[PDB]
mmCIF file of N, CA and C in Angstrom:
data_model
loop_
_atom_site.group_PDB
_atom_site.id
_atom_site.type_symbol
_atom_site.label_atom_id
_atom_site.label_comp_id
_atom_site.label_asym_id
_atom_site.label_seq_id
_atom_site.Cartn_x
_atom_site.Cartn_y
_atom_site.Cartn_z
ATOM 1 N N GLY A 1 143.388 91.586 153.868
ATOM 2 C CA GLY A 1 142.395 90.707 154.422
ATOM 3 C C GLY A 1 142.274 91.153 155.809
ATOM 4 N N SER A 2 140.991 91.054 156.422
ATOM 5 C CA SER A 2 140.765 91.316 157.815
ATOM 6 C C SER A 2 140.007 90.197 158.395
ATOM 7 N N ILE A 3 140.413 89.731 159.637
ATOM 8 C CA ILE A 3 139.762 88.725 160.241
ATOM 9 C C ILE A 3 139.366 89.253 161.781
ATOM 10 N N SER A 4 138.286 89.070 162.210
ATOM 11 C CA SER A 4 138.039 88.989 163.693
ATOM 12 C C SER A 4 137.392 87.822 164.005
ATOM 13 N N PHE A 5 137.683 87.309 165.246
ATOM 14 C CA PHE A 5 137.086 86.094 165.779
ATOM 15 C C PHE A 5 137.234 86.100 167.301
ATOM 16 N N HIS A 6 136.511 85.203 168.037
ATOM 17 C CA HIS A 6 136.536 84.872 169.296
ATOM 18 C C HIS A 6 137.546 83.701 169.503
ATOM 19 N N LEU A 7 138.221 83.826 170.489
ATOM 20 C CA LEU A 7 139.194 82.651 170.854
ATOM 21 C C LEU A 7 138.737 82.159 172.086
ATOM 22 N N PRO A 8 138.110 81.057 172.304
ATOM 23 C CA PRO A 8 137.769 80.589 173.732
ATOM 24 C C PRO A 8 139.037 80.036 174.432
ATOM 25 N N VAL A 9 138.866 79.913 175.534
ATOM 26 C CA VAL A 9 140.069 79.374 176.444
ATOM 27 C C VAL A 9 140.392 78.048 176.086
ATOM 28 N N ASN A 10 141.607 77.563 175.899
ATOM 29 C CA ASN A 10 142.080 76.275 175.566
ATOM 30 C C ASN A 10 141.553 75.924 174.025
ATOM 31 N N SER A 11 141.696 76.806 173.208
ATOM 32 C CA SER A 11 141.200 76.567 171.791
ATOM 33 C C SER A 11 142.226 76.917 170.885
ATOM 34 N N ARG A 12 142.157 76.801 169.547
ATOM 35 C CA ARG A 12 143.024 77.102 168.512
ATOM 36 C C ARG A 12 142.436 77.388 167.275
ATOM 37 N N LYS A 13 142.632 78.643 166.697
ATOM 38 C CA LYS A 13 142.079 78.901 165.453
ATOM 39 C C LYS A 13 143.131 79.333 164.388
ATOM 40 N N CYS A 14 142.971 78.976 163.270
ATOM 41 C CA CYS A 14 144.039 79.068 162.203
ATOM 42 C C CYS A 14 143.424 79.624 160.824
ATOM 43 N N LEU A 15 144.178 80.536 160.264
ATOM 44 C CA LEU A 15 143.899 80.748 158.874
ATOM 45 C C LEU A 15 144.885 80.164 158.001
ATOM 46 N N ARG A 16 144.427 79.217 157.073
ATOM 47 C CA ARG A 16 145.416 78.510 155.968
ATOM 48 C C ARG A 16 145.095 79.239 154.656
ATOM 49 N N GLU A 17 146.342 79.338 153.941
ATOM 50 C CA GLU A 17 146.263 80.062 152.684
ATOM 51 C C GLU A 17 147.097 79.173 151.653
ATOM 52 N N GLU A 18 146.491 78.924 150.519
ATOM 53 C CA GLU A 18 147.248 78.049 149.587
ATOM 54 C C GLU A 18 147.398 78.902 148.317
ATOM 55 N N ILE A 19 148.281 79.909 148.181
ATOM 56 C CA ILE A 19 148.655 80.720 146.990
ATOM 57 C C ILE A 19 149.659 79.871 146.162
ATOM 58 N N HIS A 20 149.957 80.575 144.953
ATOM 59 C CA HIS A 20 150.961 79.882 143.991
ATOM 60 C C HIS A 20 151.724 80.731 143.595
ATOM 61 N N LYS A 21 152.045 81.967 144.248
ATOM 62 C CA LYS A 21 153.020 82.833 144.023
ATOM 63 C C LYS A 21 153.988 83.022 145.158
ATOM 64 N N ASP A 22 155.424 83.354 144.944
ATOM 65 C CA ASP A 22 156.243 83.736 146.007
ATOM 66 C C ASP A 22 156.127 85.354 146.014
ATOM 67 N N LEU A 23 155.632 85.627 147.428
ATOM 68 C CA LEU A 23 155.407 87.059 147.547
ATOM 69 C C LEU A 23 155.630 87.266 149.029
ATOM 70 N N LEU A 24 155.595 88.488 149.340
ATOM 71 C CA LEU A 24 155.601 88.967 150.776
ATOM 72 C C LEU A 24 154.309 89.034 151.396
ATOM 73 N N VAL A 25 154.117 88.587 152.695
ATOM 74 C CA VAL A 25 153.007 88.598 153.309
ATOM 75 C C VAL A 25 153.293 89.411 154.797
ATOM 76 N N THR A 26 152.421 90.461 154.884
ATOM 77 C CA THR A 26 152.571 91.185 156.088
ATOM 78 C C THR A 26 151.339 91.111 156.838
ATOM 79 N N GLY A 27 151.444 91.168 158.210
ATOM 80 C CA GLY A 27 150.327 90.968 159.058
ATOM 81 C C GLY A 27 150.476 91.965 160.358
ATOM 82 N N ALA A 28 149.271 92.271 160.884
ATOM 83 C CA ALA A 28 149.234 92.936 162.164
ATOM 84 C C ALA A 28 148.039 92.347 162.929
ATOM 85 N N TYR A 29 148.264 92.105 164.311
ATOM 86 C CA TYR A 29 147.332 91.438 165.211
ATOM 87 C C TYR A 29 147.232 92.071 166.352
ATOM 88 N N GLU A 30 146.054 92.045 167.022
ATOM 89 C CA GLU A 30 145.805 92.427 168.476
ATOM 90 C C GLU A 30 144.808 91.456 168.942
ATOM 91 N N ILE A 31 145.212 90.880 170.154
ATOM 92 C CA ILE A 31 144.555 90.107 171.096
ATOM 93 C C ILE A 31 144.110 90.796 172.237
ATOM 94 N N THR A 32 142.643 90.780 172.320
ATOM 95 C CA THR A 32 141.873 91.676 173.422
ATOM 96 C C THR A 32 141.416 90.748 174.488
ATOM 97 N N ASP A 33 141.883 90.783 175.763
ATOM 98 C CA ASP A 33 141.297 89.907 176.788
ATOM 99 C C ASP A 33 140.617 90.762 177.767
ATOM 100 N N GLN A 34 139.272 90.614 177.766
ATOM 101 C CA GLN A 34 138.544 91.377 178.814
ATOM 102 C C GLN A 34 138.902 91.093 180.318
ATOM 103 N N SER A 35 139.230 89.742 180.445
ATOM 104 C CA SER A 35 139.406 89.225 181.801
ATOM 105 C C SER A 35 140.925 89.849 182.349
ATOM 106 N N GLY A 36 141.626 90.507 181.671
ATOM 107 C CA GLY A 36 142.934 90.995 182.186
ATOM 108 C C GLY A 36 143.836 89.857 182.645
ATOM 109 N N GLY A 37 143.891 88.659 181.966
ATOM 110 C CA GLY A 37 144.792 87.651 182.357
ATOM 111 C C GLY A 37 144.096 86.677 183.348
ATOM 112 N N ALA A 38 142.968 86.431 183.482
ATOM 113 C CA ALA A 38 142.277 85.608 184.481
ATOM 114 C C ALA A 38 142.697 84.207 184.162
ATOM 115 N N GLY A 39 142.783 83.280 185.125
ATOM 116 C CA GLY A 39 143.178 81.711 185.054
ATOM 117 C C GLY A 39 144.579 81.599 184.345
ATOM 118 N N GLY A 40 145.548 82.355 184.547
ATOM 119 C CA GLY A 40 146.741 82.477 183.865
ATOM 120 C C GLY A 40 146.823 82.324 182.395
ATOM 121 N N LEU A 41 145.803 83.080 181.780
ATOM 122 C CA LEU A 41 145.529 83.004 180.352
ATOM 123 C C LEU A 41 146.774 83.598 179.542
ATOM 124 N N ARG A 42 147.105 82.890 178.575
ATOM 125 C CA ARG A 42 148.284 83.379 177.447
ATOM 126 C C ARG A 42 147.821 82.783 176.196
ATOM 127 N N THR A 43 148.394 83.596 175.110
ATOM 128 C CA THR A 43 148.016 83.308 173.848
ATOM 129 C C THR A 43 149.366 83.052 172.980
ATOM 130 N N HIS A 44 149.408 81.940 172.252
ATOM 131 C CA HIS A 44 150.521 81.769 171.372
ATOM 132 C C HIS A 44 150.294 81.950 169.931
ATOM 133 N N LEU A 45 151.064 82.531 169.178
ATOM 134 C CA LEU A 45 151.079 82.929 167.746
ATOM 135 C C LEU A 45 152.096 82.027 167.105
ATOM 136 N N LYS A 46 151.736 81.241 166.026
ATOM 137 C CA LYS A 46 152.596 80.576 165.296
ATOM 138 C C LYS A 46 152.228 80.608 163.762
ATOM 139 N N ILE A 47 153.188 80.828 162.927
ATOM 140 C CA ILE A 47 153.022 80.825 161.464
ATOM 141 C C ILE A 47 154.025 79.787 160.912
ATOM 142 N N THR A 48 153.187 78.800 160.128
ATOM 143 C CA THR A 48 154.083 77.681 159.459
ATOM 144 C C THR A 48 153.938 77.620 158.097
ATOM 145 N N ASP A 49 154.837 77.005 157.344
ATOM 146 C CA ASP A 49 154.794 76.793 155.885
ATOM 147 C C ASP A 49 154.309 75.401 155.624
ATOM 148 N N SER A 50 154.261 74.975 154.498
ATOM 149 C CA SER A 50 153.550 73.544 153.981
ATOM 150 C C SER A 50 154.385 72.496 154.652
ATOM 151 N N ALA A 51 155.698 72.620 155.047
ATOM 152 C CA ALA A 51 156.449 71.504 155.634
ATOM 153 C C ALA A 51 156.601 71.637 157.088
ATOM 154 N N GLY A 52 155.798 72.603 157.670
ATOM 155 C CA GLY A 52 155.934 72.817 159.095
ATOM 156 C C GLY A 52 157.086 73.650 159.577
ATOM 157 N N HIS A 53 158.024 74.267 158.760
ATOM 158 C CA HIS A 53 158.890 75.176 159.206
ATOM 159 C C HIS A 53 158.255 76.302 159.864
ATOM 160 N N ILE A 54 158.751 76.853 160.870
ATOM 161 C CA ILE A 54 158.211 78.084 161.604
ATOM 162 C C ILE A 54 158.650 79.269 160.967
ATOM 163 N N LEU A 55 157.814 80.060 160.508
ATOM 164 C CA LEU A 55 158.112 81.455 159.817
ATOM 165 C C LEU A 55 157.996 82.448 160.833
ATOM 166 N N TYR A 56 157.294 82.437 161.851
ATOM 167 C CA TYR A 56 157.136 83.349 162.887
ATOM 168 C C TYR A 56 156.437 82.562 164.124
ATOM 169 N N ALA A 57 157.012 83.051 165.255
ATOM 170 C CA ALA A 57 156.217 82.506 166.530
ATOM 171 C C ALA A 57 156.346 83.793 167.435
ATOM 172 N N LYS A 58 155.432 83.776 168.292
ATOM 173 C CA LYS A 58 155.342 84.851 169.419
ATOM 174 C C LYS A 58 154.660 84.046 170.544
ATOM 175 N N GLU A 59 155.398 83.759 171.673
ATOM 176 C CA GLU A 59 155.075 82.782 172.749
ATOM 177 C C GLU A 59 154.107 83.337 173.659
ATOM 178 N N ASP A 60 154.095 84.775 173.856
ATOM 179 C CA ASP A 60 153.265 85.374 174.704
ATOM 180 C C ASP A 60 152.778 86.466 174.011
ATOM 181 N N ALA A 61 151.648 86.153 173.066
ATOM 182 C CA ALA A 61 151.450 87.211 172.128
ATOM 183 C C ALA A 61 150.255 88.155 172.678
ATOM 184 N N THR A 62 150.439 89.502 172.200
ATOM 185 C CA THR A 62 149.312 90.500 172.626
ATOM 186 C C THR A 62 148.924 91.329 171.485
ATOM 187 N N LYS A 63 149.777 92.145 170.988
ATOM 188 C CA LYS A 63 149.502 93.087 169.844
ATOM 189 C C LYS A 63 150.942 93.212 169.238
ATOM 190 N N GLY A 64 150.942 93.124 167.725
ATOM 191 C CA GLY A 64 152.307 93.034 167.163
ATOM 192 C C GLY A 64 152.086 92.942 165.691
ATOM 193 N N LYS A 65 153.097 92.740 164.968
ATOM 194 C CA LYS A 65 153.243 92.821 163.534
ATOM 195 C C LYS A 65 154.126 91.457 163.033
ATOM 196 N N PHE A 66 153.980 91.022 161.985
ATOM 197 C CA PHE A 66 154.730 89.968 161.334
ATOM 198 C C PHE A 66 154.971 90.068 159.900
ATOM 199 N N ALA A 67 155.926 89.427 159.361
ATOM 200 C CA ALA A 67 156.167 89.460 157.905
ATOM 201 C C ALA A 67 156.950 88.377 157.531
ATOM 202 N N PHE A 68 156.661 87.690 156.398
ATOM 203 C CA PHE A 68 157.365 86.605 155.915
ATOM 204 C C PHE A 68 157.097 86.319 154.503
ATOM 205 N N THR A 69 158.006 85.466 153.699
ATOM 206 C CA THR A 69 157.775 85.324 152.332
ATOM 207 C C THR A 69 157.484 83.869 152.069
ATOM 208 N N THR A 70 156.633 83.736 151.105
ATOM 209 C CA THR A 70 156.054 82.474 150.787
ATOM 210 C C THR A 70 157.175 81.795 149.731
ATOM 211 N N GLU A 71 157.375 80.437 150.046
ATOM 212 C CA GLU A 71 158.354 79.640 149.240
ATOM 213 C C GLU A 71 157.959 78.346 148.878
ATOM 214 N N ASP A 72 158.701 77.506 148.344
ATOM 215 C CA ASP A 72 158.402 76.261 147.735
ATOM 216 C C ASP A 72 156.926 76.135 147.435
ATOM 217 N N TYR A 73 156.118 75.310 148.368
ATOM 218 C CA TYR A 73 154.691 75.180 147.964
ATOM 219 C C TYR A 73 153.785 76.320 148.248
ATOM 220 N N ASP A 74 154.341 77.402 148.813
ATOM 221 C CA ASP A 74 153.511 78.677 148.905
ATOM 222 C C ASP A 74 152.363 78.494 149.713
ATOM 223 N N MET A 75 152.258 77.614 150.691
ATOM 224 C CA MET A 75 151.198 77.425 151.402
ATOM 225 C C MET A 75 151.638 77.799 153.036
ATOM 226 N N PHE A 76 150.754 78.627 153.723
ATOM 227 C CA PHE A 76 151.113 78.891 155.083
ATOM 228 C C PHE A 76 149.930 78.811 155.874
ATOM 229 N N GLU A 77 150.078 78.800 157.123
ATOM 230 C CA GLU A 77 149.042 78.747 158.292
ATOM 231 C C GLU A 77 149.358 79.766 159.376
ATOM 232 N N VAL A 78 148.575 80.669 159.687
ATOM 233 C CA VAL A 78 148.703 81.466 160.887
ATOM 234 C C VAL A 78 147.716 81.070 161.997
ATOM 235 N N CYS A 79 148.193 80.637 163.134
ATOM 236 C CA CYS A 79 147.385 80.003 164.164
ATOM 237 C C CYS A 79 147.613 80.775 165.442
ATOM 238 N N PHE A 80 146.499 80.950 166.114
ATOM 239 C CA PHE A 80 146.502 81.477 167.413
ATOM 240 C C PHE A 80 145.912 80.221 168.449
ATOM 241 N N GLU A 81 146.538 80.195 169.572
ATOM 242 C CA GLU A 81 146.184 79.055 170.360
ATOM 243 C C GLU A 81 146.342 79.553 171.989
ATOM 244 N N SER A 82 145.129 79.404 172.603
ATOM 245 C CA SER A 82 145.104 80.024 173.934
ATOM 246 C C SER A 82 145.251 78.868 174.973
ATOM 247 N N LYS A 83 145.814 79.132 176.287
ATOM 248 C CA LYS A 83 145.793 78.265 177.284
ATOM 249 C C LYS A 83 145.561 78.870 178.668
ATOM 250 N N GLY A 84 144.816 78.336 179.307
ATOM 251 C CA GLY A 84 144.347 78.954 180.702
ATOM 252 C C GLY A 84 143.551 77.910 181.411
ATOM 253 N N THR A 85 143.191 78.266 182.745
ATOM 254 C CA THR A 85 142.510 77.340 183.600
ATOM 255 C C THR A 85 141.258 78.070 184.037
ATOM 256 N N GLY A 86 140.302 77.254 184.344
ATOM 257 C CA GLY A 86 138.791 77.636 184.753
ATOM 258 C C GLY A 86 138.036 78.213 183.577
ATOM 259 N N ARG A 87 137.021 78.972 184.033
ATOM 260 C CA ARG A 87 136.101 79.532 182.983
ATOM 261 C C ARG A 87 136.529 80.993 182.917
ATOM 262 N N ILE A 88 136.847 81.352 181.587
ATOM 263 C CA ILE A 88 137.215 82.655 181.259
ATOM 264 C C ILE A 88 136.465 83.107 179.971
ATOM 265 N N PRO A 89 136.086 84.337 179.905
ATOM 266 C CA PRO A 89 135.334 84.933 178.793
ATOM 267 C C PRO A 89 136.265 84.886 177.540
ATOM 268 N N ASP A 90 135.589 84.602 176.303
ATOM 269 C CA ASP A 90 136.403 84.460 175.055
ATOM 270 C C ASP A 90 137.250 85.770 174.895
ATOM 271 N N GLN A 91 138.494 85.643 174.372
ATOM 272 C CA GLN A 91 139.279 86.666 173.930
ATOM 273 C C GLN A 91 138.687 86.990 172.479
ATOM 274 N N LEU A 92 138.836 88.277 172.064
ATOM 275 C CA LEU A 92 138.675 88.640 170.846
ATOM 276 C C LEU A 92 140.014 88.990 170.009
ATOM 277 N N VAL A 93 140.178 88.347 168.885
ATOM 278 C CA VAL A 93 141.451 88.500 168.041
ATOM 279 C C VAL A 93 141.108 89.250 166.644
ATOM 280 N N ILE A 94 141.943 90.206 166.315
ATOM 281 C CA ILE A 94 141.832 90.927 165.258
ATOM 282 C C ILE A 94 143.166 90.700 164.478
ATOM 283 N N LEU A 95 143.050 90.300 162.981
ATOM 284 C CA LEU A 95 144.182 89.965 162.474
ATOM 285 C C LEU A 95 144.003 90.690 160.839
ATOM 286 N N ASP A 96 144.945 91.567 160.553
ATOM 287 C CA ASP A 96 144.777 92.128 159.395
ATOM 288 C C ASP A 96 146.169 91.726 158.424
ATOM 289 N N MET A 97 146.008 91.332 157.218
ATOM 290 C CA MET A 97 146.977 90.756 156.439
ATOM 291 C C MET A 97 146.960 91.617 154.995
ATOM 292 N N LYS A 98 148.144 91.629 154.529
ATOM 293 C CA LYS A 98 148.478 92.109 153.284
ATOM 294 C C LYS A 98 149.391 91.158 152.288
ATOM 295 N N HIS A 99 148.914 91.087 151.034
ATOM 296 C CA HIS A 99 149.805 90.235 150.164
ATOM 297 C C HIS A 99 150.563 91.234 149.293
ATOM 298 N N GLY A 100 151.750 91.071 149.149
ATOM 299 C CA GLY A 100 152.526 92.077 148.242
ATOM 300 C C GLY A 100 152.759 91.652 146.882
#
């Protein structure tokens, strides 16, 4: 799966998946910020399961990869959240995922 979206400053966007198999999920992401860090901008990446356990987290996310396995209820959420001050152009996020 491939996702491209804009992420405005001080917003959160998430992909939620409810599948019913235990399998391997792999992802690759790139956050592009045309402002080069204006207004103290930073972006957090957090992946959680149905019970809120953190499967992956990246505090100051830029570009990277992740992988996790689905367990119990096999529901997960991948969330990007930005924080910054003032007016900042939207960031662009690209997220590519594979289910094994």
